[PDB]
Design an enzyme around this catalytic site. Structure first.
Site, PDB file in Angstrom:
ATOM      1  N   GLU A 150       0.792  -1.248   0.000  1.00 11.50           N
ATOM      2  CA  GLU A 150       0.000   0.000   0.000  1.00 11.50           C
ATOM      3  C   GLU A 150       0.818   1.289   0.000  1.00 11.50           C
ATOM      4  OE1 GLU A 150      -2.481  -1.405   3.167  1.00 11.50           O
ATOM      5  OE2 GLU A 150      -4.209  -1.710   1.829  1.00 11.50           O
ATOM      6  N   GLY A 174     -12.505  -4.268   1.038  1.00 15.31           N
ATOM      7  CA  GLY A 174     -13.578  -5.072   0.466  1.00 15.31           C
ATOM      8  C   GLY A 174     -14.867  -4.284   0.367  1.00 15.31           C
ATOM      9  N   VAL A 206     -12.603 -10.624   5.650  1.00 15.02           N
ATOM     10  CA  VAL A 206     -13.992 -10.991   5.468  1.00 15.02           C
ATOM     11  C   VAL A 206     -14.172 -11.596   4.068  1.00 15.02           C
ATOM     12  CG1 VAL A 206     -16.363 -10.098   5.277  1.00 15.02           C
ATOM     13  CG2 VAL A 206     -14.854  -9.327   7.150  1.00 15.02           C
ATOM     14  N   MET A 264      -9.167  -3.658   7.824  1.00 16.20           N
ATOM     15  CA  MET A 264      -8.675  -4.132   9.125  1.00 16.20           C
ATOM     16  C   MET A 264      -7.921  -3.099   9.962  1.00 16.20           C
ATOM     17  SD  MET A 264      -7.667  -7.995   7.840  1.00 16.20           S
ATOM     18  CE  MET A 264      -7.415  -8.637   9.469  1.00 16.20           C
ATOM     19  N   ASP A 324     -11.827  -6.202  -3.733  1.00 15.98           N
ATOM     20  CA  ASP A 324     -12.602  -7.451  -3.740  1.00 15.98           C
ATOM     21  C   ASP A 324     -13.986  -7.152  -3.214  1.00 15.98           C
ATOM     22  OD1 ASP A 324     -10.632  -7.444  -1.160  1.00 15.98           O
ATOM     23  OD2 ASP A 324     -12.624  -8.293  -0.610  1.00 15.98           O
TER      24      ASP A 324
HETATM   25  N1  LIG Z   1     -12.486  -8.637   2.327  1.00 14.85           N
HETATM   26  C1  LIG Z   1     -11.686  -7.948   3.171  1.00 14.85           C
HETATM   27  N2  LIG Z   1     -11.754  -8.085   4.538  1.00 14.85           N
HETATM   28  C2  LIG Z   1     -10.937  -7.380   5.370  1.00 14.85           C
HETATM   29  N3  LIG Z   1      -9.995  -6.518   4.928  1.00 14.85           N
HETATM   30  C3  LIG Z   1      -9.868  -6.330   3.595  1.00 14.85           C
HETATM   31  C4  LIG Z   1      -8.932  -5.501   2.810  1.00 14.85           C
HETATM   32  C5  LIG Z   1      -7.879  -4.489   3.248  1.00 14.85           C
HETATM   33  N4  LIG Z   1      -6.630  -4.872   3.897  1.00 14.85           N
HETATM   34  C6  LIG Z   1      -5.918  -5.926   3.145  1.00 14.85           C
HETATM   35  C7  LIG Z   1      -5.280  -6.843   4.193  1.00 14.85           C
HETATM   36  C8  LIG Z   1      -5.947  -8.210   4.046  1.00 14.85           C
HETATM   37  S1  LIG Z   1      -5.188  -9.486   5.022  1.00 14.85           S
HETATM   38  C9  LIG Z   1      -3.881 -10.265   4.238  1.00 14.85           C
HETATM   39  C10 LIG Z   1      -3.478  -9.947   2.946  1.00 14.85           C
HETATM   40  N5  LIG Z   1      -2.438 -10.612   2.406  1.00 14.85           N
HETATM   41  C11 LIG Z   1      -1.770 -11.570   3.073  1.00 14.85           C
HETATM   42  C12 LIG Z   1      -2.168 -11.888   4.357  1.00 14.85           C
HETATM   43  N6  LIG Z   1      -3.210 -11.242   4.902  1.00 14.85           N
HETATM   44  C13 LIG Z   1      -5.517  -6.108   5.499  1.00 14.85           C
HETATM   45  O1  LIG Z   1      -4.466  -5.157   5.707  1.00 14.85           O
HETATM   46  C14 LIG Z   1      -6.806  -5.328   5.288  1.00 14.85           C
HETATM   47  C15 LIG Z   1      -9.296  -5.737   1.486  1.00 14.85           C
HETATM   48  N7  LIG Z   1     -10.320  -6.639   1.404  1.00 14.85           N
HETATM   49  C16 LIG Z   1     -10.700  -7.029   2.619  1.00 14.85           C
END
Ligand SMILES: Nc1ncnc2c(CN3C[C@H](CSc4cnccn4)[C@@H](O)C3)c[nH]c12
Ligand SMILES: Nc1ncnc2c(CN3C[C@H](CSc4cnccn4)[C@@H](O)C3)c[nH]c12
EC number: 3.2.2.30
Lengths: 230, 230
Positions: free
Chosen positions: A13, A80, A154, A174, A198
């Protein structure tokens, strides 16, 4: 003179942020983070990734304020989507944030609520309004809404439905709530900016892996356009 | 000369600590916390309650270190028991802590694990050994084991079974992992001490309300006996 903290969660990021500002940085390690300190357009910019989740982001934000004296915090990264009109790559700023995984319902507290606190945390109206101004000038869409933050990735329809019904959230990630929370405690203006990676469903892992780079870059570019007008 | 940070989560966890030390304190507000600064046995003691949960406790611990310069952190309060041999009022020190609600399994990470971190956080062996020494000298029982921390009050057999099987935790609470985490990042020795208030089951709310005061006092008294030997 002016000191601006710029945060991501993941190294991915902030990589585009450092590239896009295009100035030299000094690296300063503190509390297990590396802070990149540079000067851009007569402002001191302090850039860092917190590492994932609420404890990591709370620590890094607190260090930015207490150790580096930043006067505003701008967060940039990916999220997300929980609503149909927020699609891959689309941008939003959080009007409010909530810690969606907080549960003290055993004592009849509403979900998300902690005593001596509140369910929803506000961000800077002024920074959000700047973001809106800029997005209109650039002819790009920008949503404003609630972002839900917790310590789980999520990826299930059941959890999305919960976030929508319980909090009316538009996106999930998160770190945002923790960053905004610390900032408000210290009276520091905060803006939380995300680009959709996503749809927070069973396919979210796939989508996230595909779109992390592009979505992070989209957020980074927008953040820089904000700094250019501060 | 020596500066010792003393933390609880709830006001009820520090009320007995302030009473038991029995010295005058100055109140210093910072980041939405009130820090009570006093001198006891030629040490500077900085006492505060964080407020509940992981963000609150991360912020307060970070402030203690960065703003007040504490050299050790001792946490005192109450916890839910996950094992039959830890009963109401019994004391334990955490050998390790885990954030039990962290879930990045969507990317095939083990539960509790965050990239660039670890599932288990260590505390000070030296402080734990002091605690053990003192408890034997006082003829009181003291367990040593894993404490699980998360942002939910645990009150269900299903969640207990999970904490036991996944992490081998002996007790559950909402702050210890975050405090230990921050301390380790800054190379600050940390001890997390708890007294059992409930059994983390469907009756936990009841038990907690009944025993909070007594269990907090039990923990506070023990913490003071530790400070008396530092
Ligand atoms: N559906 C979702 N739910 C919760 N958080 C998010 C995110 C945003 N960020 C990306 C990352 C995912 S965990 C991670 C990523 N790569 C390797 C290991 N863990 C965390 O920093 C939160 C994007 N989509 C999300
Ligand atoms: N079973 C359990 N699960 C998780 N944590 C605990 C604790 C320890 N503390 C007490 C308090 C409960 S929440 C709270 C308390 N009062 C009012 C509102 N919320 C929180 O600070 C963690 C004791 N038993 C626990």
């Amino acid at each position: 003179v002016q000191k601006i903290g710029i945060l991501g969660a993941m190294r991915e990021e902030i990589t585009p942020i450092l590239e896009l500002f295009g100035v030299d940085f000094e690296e300063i390690p503190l509390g297990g983070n590396v802070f990149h300190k540079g000067v851009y357009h007569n402002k001191e910019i302090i850039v860092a990734y917190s590492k994932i989740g609420k404890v990591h982001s709370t620590l890094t934000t607190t260090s930015m304020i207490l150790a580096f004296g930043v006067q505003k915090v701008l967060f940039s990264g990916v999220a997300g989507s929980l609503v149909k009109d927020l699609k891959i790559n689309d941008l939003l700023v959080a009007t409010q944030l909530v810690q969606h995984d907080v549960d003290l319902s055993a004592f009849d507290h509403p979900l998300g609520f902690i005593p001596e606190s509140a369910i929803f945390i506000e961000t800077s109206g002024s920074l959000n309004a700047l973001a809106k101004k800029i997005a209109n000038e650039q002819h790009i869409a920008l949503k404003e809404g609630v972002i839900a933050s917790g310590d789980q990735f999520v990826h299930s329809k059941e959890r999305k439905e919960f976030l929508v019904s319980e909090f009316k959230a538009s996106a999930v990630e998160m770190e945002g709530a923790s960053v905004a929370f610390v900032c408000q405690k210290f009276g520091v203006p905060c803006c939380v900016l995300r680009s959709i990676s996503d749809n927070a469903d069973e396919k979210a892992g796939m989508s996230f892996d595909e779109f992390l780079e592009k979505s992070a870059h989209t957020s980074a570019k927008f953040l820089k356009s904000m700094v250019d007008e501060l």
